[PDB]
Amino acid sequence: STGSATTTPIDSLDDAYITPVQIGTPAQTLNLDFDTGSSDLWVFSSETTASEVDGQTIYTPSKSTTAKLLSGATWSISYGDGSSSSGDVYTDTVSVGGLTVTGQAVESAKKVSSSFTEDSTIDGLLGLAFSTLNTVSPTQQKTFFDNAKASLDSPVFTADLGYHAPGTYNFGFIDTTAYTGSITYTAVSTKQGFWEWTSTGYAVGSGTFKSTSIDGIADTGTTLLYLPATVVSAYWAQVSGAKSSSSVGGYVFPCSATLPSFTFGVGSARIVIPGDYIDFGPISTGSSSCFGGIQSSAGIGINIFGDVALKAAFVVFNGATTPTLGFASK
Numbered sequence: 001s002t003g004s005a006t007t008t009p010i011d012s013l014d015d016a017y018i019t020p021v022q023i024g025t026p027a028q029t030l031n032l033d034f035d036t037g038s039s040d041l042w043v044f045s046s047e048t049t050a051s052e053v054d055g056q057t058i059y060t061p062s063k064s065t066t067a068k069l070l071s072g073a074t075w076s077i078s079y080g081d082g083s084s085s086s087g088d089v090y091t092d093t094v095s096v097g098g099l100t101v102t103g104q105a106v107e108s109a110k111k112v113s114s115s116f117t118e119d120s121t122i123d124g125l126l127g128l129a130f131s132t133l134n135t136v137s138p139t140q141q142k143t144f145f146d147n148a149k150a151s152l153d154s155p156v157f158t159a160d161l162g163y164h165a166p167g168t169y170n171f172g173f174i175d176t177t178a179y180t181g182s183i184t185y186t187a188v189s190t191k192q193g194f195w196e197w198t199s200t201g202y203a204v205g206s207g208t209f210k211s212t213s214i215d216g217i218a219d220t221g222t223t224l225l226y227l228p229a230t231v232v233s234a235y236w237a238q239v240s241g242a243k244s245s246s247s248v249g250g251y252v253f254p255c256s257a258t259l260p261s262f263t264f265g266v267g268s269a270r271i272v273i274p275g276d277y278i279d280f281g282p283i284s285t286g287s288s289s290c291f292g293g294i295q296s297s298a299g300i301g302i303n304i305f306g307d308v309a310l311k312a313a314f315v316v317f318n319g320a321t322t323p324t325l326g327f328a329s330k
């Protein structure tokens with residue numbers, strides 16, 4: 001089997017991407033944030049605290065003839081951005097782009113943090129990291145990909161995120177029309193539950209490539225590119241007037257700037273992030289200070305190849321017995 005679904009930026013900055021997902025019988029379609037950095041499929045629901053729902057579409061399990069309470073199961077998650085959610089668990093039929101899993105754990109939110117309530121565009125998350133990170137207790141549950149894997153034509157999914165434009169998630173096949181040149185594969189460690197890999201180095205604009213190992217995670221559920229402070233200082237030193245602002249919480253730059261590109265290594269291959277991808281716009285409405293898309297990972301404890309980096313590539317999440325990542329230009 002295969003599936004193919006379009007993913008759409010939630011706003012003009014590509015702050016996140018939503019993908020429609022069918023849950024239940026008859027189908028209830030919710031727009032979920034596909035997150036290769038976490039392993040829970042959770043949704044706004046008919047059980048969510050009413051004051052914490054502001055415009056989201058909700059899953060109502062009582063209206064699904066295939067929904068079953070997973071007796072005694074609860075879940076509770078915190079994300080790197082300080083956001084959180086928790087609740088109870090149903091199993092139900094879940095379809096993405098024509099690919100159907102029966103008996104998927106659908107984690108129904110009873111509580112969500114302020115950031116989730118305040119974002120009307122995201123109805124929940126669909127985790128695509130390894131199932132060892134799933135938070136369901138007392139019986140840990142499998143991701144949508146882990147449940148689908150054995151049925152797929154090939155045990156893979158791909159992320160093709162757009163810059164200010166829709167993109168695609170595919171399951172079970174690699175669309176050879178969707179990228180240029182060849183796919184370079186690189187080793188993955190699953191020891192922390194992430195798609196964790198080692199970049200071979202970086203360049204700033206037309207500068208020389210620096211060969212240096214940068215361990216980090218491929219994370220579709222993080223907006224920005226978080227890298228070591230040495231690398232980030234080198235990038236922003238090429239932008240007149242750029243500075244790290246403790247009050248704003250990262251590097252800012254004059255909105256009148258033209259930003260340089262950023263290149264990262266995948267083995268002997270190179271992925272180029274255009275400068276425009278690194279502009280996240282005014283820090284507040286009408287400001288001439290703009291927020292940078294490359295930020296320090298100091299204090300996060302891991303480097304994160306988020307959407308700023310991934311949207312410059314066609315990315316293969318290879319779930320073979322020994323997982324690997326693939327990157328192509330596009």
Ligand SMILES: NCc1cnc2ccccc2c1
Pocket residue numbers: 035036037038079080081219220221222300302
């Ligand atoms: N996309 C989910 C996510 C969020 N925040 C994180 C912070 C540190 C490490 C991994 C993280 C993964």
Ligand SMILES: NCc1cnc2ccccc2c1
Pocket residue numbers: 016033035037079080081083115116119122221222
């Ligand atoms: N890194 C995963 C993640 C964390 N927090 C969020 C808050 C609001 C919307 C989407 C979010 C996604």
